[PDB]
Amino acid sequence: ETWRTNFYYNDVFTWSVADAPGNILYTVQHSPQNNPFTAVLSQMYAGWAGGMQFRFIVAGSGVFGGRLVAAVIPPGIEIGPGLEVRQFPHVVIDARSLEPVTITMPDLRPNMYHPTGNPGLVPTLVLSVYNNLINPFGGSTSAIQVTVETRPSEDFEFVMIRAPSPADLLTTPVLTGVGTDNRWNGEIVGLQPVPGGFSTCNRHWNLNGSTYGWSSPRFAAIDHDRGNASFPSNVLELWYASAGSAADNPISQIAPDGFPDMSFVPFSGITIPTAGWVGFGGIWNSSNGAPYVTTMQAYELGFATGVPSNPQPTTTTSGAQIVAKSIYGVANGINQTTAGLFVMASGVISTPNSSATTYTPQPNRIVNAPGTPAAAPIGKNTPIMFASVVRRTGDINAEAGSTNGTQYGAGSQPLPVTIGLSLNNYSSALMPGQFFVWQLNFASGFMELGLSVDGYFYAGTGASATLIDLSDLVDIRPVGPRPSTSTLVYNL
Amino acid sequence: ETWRTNFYYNDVFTWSVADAPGNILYTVQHSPQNNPFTAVLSQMYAGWAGGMQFRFIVAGSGVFGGRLVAAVIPPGIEIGPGLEVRQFPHVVIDARSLEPVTITMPDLRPNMYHPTGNPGLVPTLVLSVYNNLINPFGGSTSAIQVTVETRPSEDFEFVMIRAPSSKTVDSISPADLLTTPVLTGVGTDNRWNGEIVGLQPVPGGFSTCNRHWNLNGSTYGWSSPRFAAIDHDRGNASFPGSSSSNVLELWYASAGSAADNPISQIAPDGFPDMSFVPFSGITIPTAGWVGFGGIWNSSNGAPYVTTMQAYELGFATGVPSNPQPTTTTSGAQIVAKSIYGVANGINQTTAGLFVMASGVISTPNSSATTYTPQPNRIVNAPGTPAAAPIGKNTPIMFASVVRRTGDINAEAGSTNGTQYGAGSQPLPVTIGLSLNNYSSALMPGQFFVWQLNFASGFMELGLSVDGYFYAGTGASATLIDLSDLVDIRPVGPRPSTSTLVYNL
Amino acid sequence: ETWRTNFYYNDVFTWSVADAPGNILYTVQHSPQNNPFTAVLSQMYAGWAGGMQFRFIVAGSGVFGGRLVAAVIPPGIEIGPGLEVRQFPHVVIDARSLEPVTITMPDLRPNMYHPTGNPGLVPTLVLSVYNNLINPFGGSTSAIQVTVETRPSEDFEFVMIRAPSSKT
Amino acid sequence: ETWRTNFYYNDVFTWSVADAPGNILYTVQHSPQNNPFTAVLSQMYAGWAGGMQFRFIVAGSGVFGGRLVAAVIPPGIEIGPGLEVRQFPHVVIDARSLEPVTITMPDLRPNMYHPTGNPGLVPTLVLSVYNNLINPFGGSTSAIQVTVETRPSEDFEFVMIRAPSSKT
């Protein structure tokens, strides 16, 4: 048969210069899922038996040195850091070898066949360092790749016949111009590294399908019906309420669904706040649901403390207050003890003049509930945050590449990724301490993008801060779960 | 190999006492999709050849009478009602037989092997009546079942190996476009941007062009599949009266002036396709598209801060004289005019418009209203193909819950009422149709059918080649809920003249 | 040995006209307690291995119609309503058959032998409706009986002798 | 014959450090135009059948690292950016290999022979980046050239003869 006479690609792993001798680089249990074709045949069979052959190909060069060791471990032996692989019957893999080196994994079992449901006890293959990699020329190259291919052995067979992963979340449409961020609902057109770090809870799901925010994966109008509205022909109507009182929201009670999580910016008199979340709406009467036809205006929202007399920006939801104020004079003011609020969920940015500013929100402006994990740089990897263009009140005509500058809005995750995360559970597809890596194919280069357990995305930009343009993207290919301590490739 | 020695279940068909001699009951084309195991092996190969055996099992009794005929038809012969099956080499199946009857279908082909994507010319198996079934004892039993089992022949083989994830030529099919999350509460319609909560059949028929793509990668509208700002710079804005205080701003411009819109010049991107509802004075318009916004200066981009109000948008004609609703894009005027008093009026010959795309419906009071828009309110460009009922199948619109101005707190189930919107397609389906091309997936006159499984019962949903969705509701016009939906299973192409299944 | 050359009665079940296609009528796991004679000898042995042959007799008549399907399920597969018995290698039993239809149940096992106390993983035999029973004449009859018989295979044997009064 | 026992130059393509893994660097359809001598004899014949052998020479050096993968695609399968070349039966070409690497492309066809006018369905050969190229020394050198040579297989032959002045 043709499907058992040639080798086929199975997996690829990275060998670094910083790996001390005795470290394990690659491990795999005996199973039919290690071959593209037997993994397809396993649907129509209930058991299997026999060995498998592996072949390693080193994509090194003629100037490197160092060796690996590969051995097969019988069942019933614990695998851990203190494993003397150099004592088991093994083979030596050189860093600068040309011809591929093969090891054969016999099927050591106590039973007669392995059912596809519960395999039982099976051997294991381990690749560990024999002598660490060296590079006499120094430089910026410090890692090489190794590829693994498999082929069923002569005695492999299937016995009884029966009736017949987070890789799909990120696809080319998500980043080519169709997907949108989760904070401003705009086309994603860039990636913005954040060396300092940040944190986010609103509309940000992890891989356990649980979020610490107060919003749902959609953009819908904000509705709150118990608040204080007062004003001091043209006046600035002001609305505020106590945080942690929105009982009508089933997901969480800190704030109404869709409330922006930016710190409120104080402003009074003839002035325009800078870097503020602006939405269109007004006040309505809670008695009968009728809207007050004079307070339709461009209101600005946020989080603040000491609202009635001494407003002050804040970054914690514990004992805070929510503020909604109009940026321009309203037609007629209203003083009601109990009132409702209604504003569109897709915001814009406020700016006193027509010149653009830096991207928003800056890392210090995010308001998060207590108990949220933080995204901090690890190794050479840097967290990034997706940037999109957003209209500004200073100039509405400027949309992209205008001579007056460009305003970029930023979000933690693309919307489809968040929707997928909140729809299902991926806790079993990744263990802590490692990333899930995608590869991006540019017009004249490439780079890798990695997702952690908490839901943040990481890139190997290091101590840089320049925005990365996405107008040259072609397609995205999944790579697989890789350790979080390895530098991601950045070739641009 | 064990998988090629035993028979396995393929299909079942019914034989009725009302079938006249010469009728055809069951036809299948030679293909590896006729066996449970070759249908799986074909995923990892590129060609096949050889014959296949068929075994027929009759679930009858010893009291009935009658016979069938089975024959294999060579390639190149037209199949139809007037086919002399009994003159081809054939076998006879008895209605009261015990042992299964087996017929072998050899591989008659002009080539050497069949590529899996495109089989080419292949033979066909036809079942017909030889003598009509009879029931001497009478009674309520007037039909019997027949089951078909298949087994590969001794010469069957696959020839060429390929990657399991590879795709053959013309292998595209929109099976994955519609999926359970889309109609469970994640997807939204392409008119009101609210989650889908109902289906509203339209016996009258309708047409839609804005934000609506067919299965050929083209649309006749002016909006891209996305909600964003509605932007336009060249337009006239003026208000009546002398003292500008709590006055109504009105903005109008000639259609076909959206030069900066690349997809089309008919209207600014994202403009609704709703006919204008003229009104003046204190009167509040009924069933209109209302979006927040204002007016911005065309000289520097700064906005006139005093013009911010809840505006209403629509198509009309004769704007200066008197608004007149129209449903024709050619020779019309795009006009937006505020419904509430603005802080201070503005009089410019040239002025801009900036309105959000997430709109609401204006009502005079807290009373609810029928689903909007009505089929006579859609503004559509010339040349837009229409949707009309075919047989018992009727087009549908997707129903979502949408905010209304009269009561902006009534969401669902409220005693005040419940307002419903209507959309031609779910948004994910629109995006999927926009990205790719599905022209080589259906012949003109076929419906790709999805089967929806509710909590108690199931129905089927069909999709035409123009993007319209059809269902066989007959003459009913009631909304149907989806809070009971569980899963959706694809079915495949079907003739458009077959009535859809509505098992409720 | 005469005790392994003839079929003997095991159990009987009812097939009714109200059973739709796909419902399961009779299931049994591989065990020595499916034969009246093997159950006695199981007292003096500690393990067993081998197959068993099943024979089905239908107490029908010439006026009924309908068919059942019988198949053997390999170990490790869940048994329940969502099982396609019709896609496993099977045989067909007709409602008016005269000569009994026999299916052989091989011993699919991962171990050498099954201990008498805890057998471990064993195959299962399943009957299901393949076409629902019908009665053209109607009347007062709505169901028929089906009788099951077993016989040890040629390879069935007991492995190790143990004290008759011992406890597992 | 001398024209079917030696390799002759056909084409050349460039492999650079900016090529991501999975990128396709060279595609060619099976035709007699891929060899200098089958092209000239193609005038006086009407149809052909048989395979063709390809040989790749890498003009690299012992300092570079990286590998290419070549495979033959059956007819009727779409070629595009999302093609898993590494799952087809393939050969690997090294960036610092010295001896040339040869892969034989068989004539996979559904018909008897390929007419010279309309060849119909034919196989395709694809080179893809299997591990990206790396230069430890750095500097300006960022690409190497690969030369491709062809030779008719043993079963290559022309079937029907026609006047050289005819048009298809």
3-state secondary structure B352-415: CEEECCCCEEECCCCCCCCCECCCCCECECCCCCCECCECCEEEEEEEEECCECCCCCCCCCCC
Cβ atoms of B311 and B290 within 8 Å: the answer is yes
Q: Is-cis flag, bond preceding B320, omega within 30?
A: no
Same domain, B45 and B112: yes
Report DSSP state, residue B433: H
Contact (CB<8Å) A118/C77: no
And the tokens for D63? 């300092």
Question: From the list B43, B366, B431, which residue is nearest A178 (CB)?
Answer: B431
Give the Cα separation of A1 and A9 in Å (integer). Answer: 18
Per-residue burial over A358-382, b if 16 or more Cβ lie within 10 Å, else e, is ebbbbeebbbbbeebeebebeeebb
Query: Dihedral of the CA atoms B283, B285, B291, B297 (nearest 10)?
Result: -50
Give the Cα separation of C103 and C90 in Å (integer). Answer: 9
Q: Does A contact C via 3+ CB–CB distances below 8 Å?
A: yes
For the beta sheet containing B90-94, the strands, ordered from the edge strand earlier in sequence to the opposite edge, are B24-29, B124-134, B65-73, B90-94
Cβ atoms of A224 and A284 within 8 Å: the answer is no
And the tokens for A69? 């060791």
Pairing between strand B502-503 and B114-115? Answer: unpaired
Cβ atoms of B148 and B58 within 8 Å: the answer is no
Using DSSP's 3-state secondary structure scheme, residue C40 falls into helix
* Residue at a domain's end among A289, A314, A345: A345
Give the Cα separation of B153 and B156 in Å (integer). Answer: 6
Q: Does A400 touch chain B (CB under 8 A)?
A: no
Q: What are the backbone dihedrals phi and psi of residue A218, each rounded to the nearest 5 degrees, phi first?
A: -160, 170
Give the Cα separation of A142 and A66 in Å (integer). Answer: 13
Give the Cα separation of A87 and A67 in Å (integer). Answer: 15
Question: From the list B2, B98, B139, which residue is nearest C136 (CB)?
Answer: B139
| Distance between first and last Cα of chain B | 46
Same domain, A328 and A460: no
Name the nearest CA neighbour of D70 among D27, D10, D107.
D27
- C-chain CB neighbours of B8 within 8 Å are 86-87
Task: Decide if B167 is inside a domain.
Answer: no
Same domain, B243 and B353: yes
- Whats the size of chain B, residue-wise? 504
Same domain, B86 and B110: yes
Nearest 5°: the CA angle A49, A53, A55 is 155
Give the Cα separation of B356 and B229 in Å (integer). Answer: 5
Contact (CB<8Å) D84/B165: yes
Task: List the domain range (segments joined by +) for residue A192.
Answer: 172-212+355-491
* Residue at a domain's end among A345, A375, A397: A345
Distance from CA of D151 to the nearest CA of A (A): 25
Nearest CA in chain A to D80: A475
Cβ atoms of A239 and A229 within 8 Å: the answer is yes
Name the nearest CA neighbour of D71 among D59, D57, D86.
D86
Task: Decide if B23 is inside a domain.
Answer: yes
Task: Decide if D49 is inside a domain.
Answer: yes
Give the Cα separation of A329 and A311 in Å (integer). Answer: 19
Name the nearest CA neighbour of B228 among A191, A391, A190.
A391
For the beta sheet containing C8-16, the strands, ordered from the edge strand earlier in sequence to the opposite edge, are C8-16, C143-152, C52-58, C101-105
And the tokens for A348? 């814009």
Nearest 5°: the CA angle A312, A315, A316 is 110
**Judged by CB atoms within 8 Å, which residues 354-383 of B form the interface with D?**
none
Name the nearest CA neighbour of D84 among B164, A446, A170.
B164
Nearest CA in chain A to D60: A61
Contact (CB<8Å) B8/C64: no
Beta strands in chain C (DSSP E): 8-16, 24-29, 47-49, 52-58, 65-73, 90-94, 101-105, 114-115, 124-134, 143-152, 157-158
| Distance between first and last Cα of chain D | 28
Report DSSP state, residue B499: P
Name the nearest CA neighbour of B120 among B40, B174, B47.
B47
Contact (CB<8Å) B145/C130: no
Distance from CA of A444 to the nearest CA of D (A): 6
Give the Cα separation of A352 and B249 in Å (integer). Answer: 25
Name the nearest CA neighbour of B235 among B186, B271, B195.
B271
Same domain, B19 and B138: yes
And the tokens for B38? 């070759």
Instruction: Name every residue whose Cβ is closer than 8 Å to that of residue B379 and which is 6 or more positions away in sequence.
Output: B273, B274, B275, B315, B326, B327, B328, B329, B332
CB pairs under 8 A between A and B: 128
Give the Cα separation of A4 and B246 in Å (integer). Answer: 82
Give the Cα separation of A437 and A476 in Å (integer). Answer: 11
Instruction: Name every residue whose Cβ is closer than 8 Å to that of residue C159 and which is 6 or more positions away in sequence.
Output: C45, C46, C47, C48, C49, C113
Give the Cα separation of B225 and B428 in Å (integer). Answer: 9
Task: Decide if C161 is inside a domain.
Answer: no
Nearest CA in chain D to A135: D136
- Residue B321, amino acid: S
Instruction: Name every residue whose Cβ is closer than 8 Å to that of residue A299 and which is 6 or more positions away in sequence.
Output: A237, A239, A278, A279, A280, A281, A282, A324, A325, A326, A327, A343
- Whats the size of chain D, residue-wise? 168
Name the nearest CA neighbour of D107 among D75, D143, D59.
D75
Name the nearest CA neighbour of B263 among B218, B214, B233.
B218
Tell me the sheet residues that pair with A145. A14
Instruction: Name every residue whose Cβ is closer than 8 Å to that of residue B97 and which is 6 or more positions away in sequence.
Output: B58, B60
And the tokens for C68? 């059942």
Contact (CB<8Å) D88/B161: yes
The structural domain count of chain D equals: 1
Q: Does D91 touch chain A (CB under 8 A)?
A: no
Which DSSP helix (H) or strand (E) runs through B428?
Answer: helix B427-435
Give the Cα separation of D54 and D127 in Å (integer). Answer: 12
Give the Cα separation of A195 and A192 in Å (integer). Answer: 10
Q: Give me the sign of the Cα torsion angle B4, B6, B12, B16.
A: positive
DSSP string, B318-364: -TTT--EE--BSTT-EEEEEESS-BSS---BSS--EEE-SS-EEE-S
Which DSSP helix (H) or strand (E) runs through D68?
Answer: strand D65-73
- A-chain CB neighbours of B302 within 8 Å are 354, 394-395
- B-chain CB neighbours of A40 within 8 Å are 40, 43-44, 164
Chain B neighbors (3+ CB pairs < 8 Å):
A, C, D
Contact (CB<8Å) B409/A284: yes
Q: Please compute, for residue D132, the number of CA atoms within 13 A of its CA located in the half-sphere on the CB side.
A: 23
Contact (CB<8Å) C63/B63: yes
Give the Cα separation of A224 and D71 in Å (integer). Answer: 63
Name the nearest CA neighbour of B423 among B175, B210, B176.
B210
Name the nearest CA neighbour of D124 among D87, D73, D52, D164.
D73
Contact (CB<8Å) B8/C86: yes
Per-residue burial over D99-116, b if 16 or more Cβ lie within 10 Å, else e, is eebebebebbbbeebbeb
Which CATH number goes with the domain that contains D28? 2.60.120.20
Q: Does A98 touch chain D (CB under 8 A)?
A: yes
- Residue D112, amino acid: M
Give the Cα separation of D19 and A255 in Å (integer). Answer: 49
Tell me the sheet residues that pair with B247. B342
Cβ atoms of B301 and A405 within 8 Å: the answer is no
Report DSSP state, residue B262: S
**CA–CA distances in Å: residue B147 to residues A281, C65, C132:** 65, 14, 12
Resolution in angstrom units: 3.4
Which DSSP helix (H) or strand (E) runs through B293?
Answer: strand B288-296
Tell me the sheet residues that pair with B219. B213
Beta strands in B62-204 (DSSP E): 65-73, 90-94, 101-105, 114-115, 124-134, 143-152, 157-158, 196-201
Cβ atoms of B454 and B374 within 8 Å: the answer is no
- Residue A354, amino acid: S
Q: Which method, experimentally, gave rise to this model?
A: cryo-EM
Best of C129, C133, C137 to disrupt the B interface (most B CBs within 10 Å) is C137
Distance from CA of D72 to the nearest CA of B (A): 10
Q: Give me the sign of the Cα torsion angle A292, A294, A298, A303.
A: negative
Same domain, A204 and A341: no
Query: Dihedral of the CA atoms C27, C33, C37, C41 (nearest 10)?
Result: 160
Best of D67, D108, D131 to disrupt the A interface (most A CBs within 10 Å) is D131
Using DSSP's 3-state secondary structure scheme, residue B434 falls into helix
Contact (CB<8Å) B296/A396: yes
Question: From the list D77, D87, D109, which residue is nearest B168 (CB)?
Answer: D77
Same domain, A266 and A373: no
And the tokens for A423? 């729809």
Q: Does B437 touch chain D (CB under 8 A)?
A: no
Cβ atoms of A413 and A457 within 8 Å: the answer is yes
Give the Cα separation of B192 and B422 in Å (integer). Answer: 7
Contact (CB<8Å) A8/D92: no
Contact (CB<8Å) B160/D121: no
Give the Cα separation of A393 and A263 in Å (integer). Answer: 19
Give the Cα separation of B379 and B254 in Å (integer). Answer: 15
Same domain, A366 and A472: yes
Q: Give me the sign of the Cα torsion angle D7, D13, D17, D19.
A: negative
Cβ atoms of A364 and A315 within 8 Å: the answer is yes
Give the Cα separation of A31 and A52 in Å (integer). Answer: 9
Give the position of tokens 């960022």: D142
Question: From the list A40, A186, A393, which residue is nearest B44 (CB)?
Answer: A40
Task: Decide if D162 is inside a domain.
Answer: no
- Residue A108, amino acid: L
Contact (CB<8Å) D81/A474: yes
Give the position of tokens 């043993």: D154
Cβ atoms of A425 and A220 within 8 Å: the answer is no
Name the nearest CA neighbour of A469 among A189, A134, A255, A213.
A189
Instruction: Name every residue whose Cβ is closer than 8 Å to that of residue D34 and which is 6 or more positions away in sequence.
Output: D10, D28, D52, D150
Cβ atoms of D122 and D30 within 8 Å: the answer is yes
DSSP string, B29-89: E--GGGSTTHHHHGGGBSEEE--EEEEEEEE--TT-EEEEEEEEEPTT---SSS--GGGSS
DSSP string, B232-245: E-S-EEE-SSSS-S
Task: Decide if C61 is inside a domain.
Answer: yes
Report DSSP state, residue C112: S
Give the Cα separation of D4 and B50 in Å (integer). Answer: 36
**CA–CA distances in Å: residue B463 to residues B384, B441, B446, B477, B504:** 17, 12, 9, 19, 21
Give the Cα separation of D42 and D158 in Å (integer). Answer: 8
Give the Cα separation of C126 and B90 in Å (integer). Answer: 36
Instruction: Name every residue whose Cβ is closer than 8 Å to that of residue B234 and which is 6 or more positions away in sequence.
Output: B253, B257, B298, B350, B352
Q: Does A393 touch chain B (CB under 8 A)?
A: yes
Contact (CB<8Å) D63/A60: no
**Judged by CB atoms within 8 Å, which residues 165-184 of B form the interface with A?**
181
Distance from CA of D140 to the nearest CA of A (A): 14
Contact (CB<8Å) C74/A164: no
Give the Cα separation of A382 and A196 in Å (integer). Answer: 9
Task: Decide if D150 is inside a domain.
Answer: yes
Same domain, B24 and B50: yes
- A-chain CB neighbours of B227 within 8 Å are 185, 346
Q: Does C120 touch chain A (CB under 8 A)?
A: no
Burial category of C108 from C-beta neighbours within 10 Å (exposed 0-12, middle 13-18, buried 19 and up): buried
- Residue B186, amino acid: V
Name the nearest CA neighbour of D106 among B161, A4, A422.
B161
Cβ atoms of A381 and A421 within 8 Å: the answer is no
Per-residue burial over A294-326, b if 16 or more Cβ lie within 10 Å, else e, is bbbbbbbbbbbbebeeebebbeebeebbbbbbb
| Distance between first and last Cα of chain A | 44
Q: Does D87 touch chain A (CB under 8 A)?
A: yes
And the tokens for D163? 């006047």
Per-residue burial over A46-76, b if 16 or more Cβ lie within 10 Å, else e, is bbbbbbbbbebbbbbbebbebbbbbbbbeee
Query: Dihedral of the CA atoms A310, A316, A321, A327 (nearest 10)?
Result: 70
Per-residue burial over B236-269, b if 16 or more Cβ lie within 10 Å, else e, is bbebeeeeeebbbbbbbbebebbeebeebebbbb
Question: HEC string of chain A?
Answer: CHHHCCCEEEEEEEEECCCCCCCEEEEEECCHHHCCCHHHHHHHECEEECCEEEEEEECCCCCCEEEEEEEEECCCCCCCCCCCHHHCCEEEEECCCCCCEEEEECCCCCCCCEECCCCCCCCEEEEEEEEEEECCCCCCCCEEEEEEEEEECCCCEECCECCCCCCCCCCHHHHHCCCEECCCCCEEEEEEECCCCECCCCCCCCCCCCCCCCCCCCCCCEEEEEEEEECCCCECCEEEEECCCCCCCCCCCCCCCCCCCEECCCCCCCCCCCCCEEEEEEEECCCCCCECCCCCEEEEEEEEECCCCCCEECCECCCCEEEEEECCCECCCCCEEEEEEEECCCCEECCCCCCCCCCECCHHHECECCCCCCECCECCEEEEEEEEECCECCECCCCCCCCCCCCEEEECCEHHHHHHHHHCCCHHHCCCCEEEEEEEEECCEEEEEEECCCCCEEECCCCCCCCEECCCCCEEEEEEEEECCCCCCEEC
Question: From the list A113, A116, A163, which residue is nearest C87 (CB)?
Answer: A163
**CA–CA distances in Å: residue A121 to residues A196, A265, C22:** 47, 63, 36
Distance from CA of C77 to the nearest CA of B (A): 18
Task: Decide if B225 is inside a domain.
Answer: no
Cβ atoms of A232 and A329 within 8 Å: the answer is no
Same domain, B147 and B197: no
CB pairs under 8 A between B and C: 52
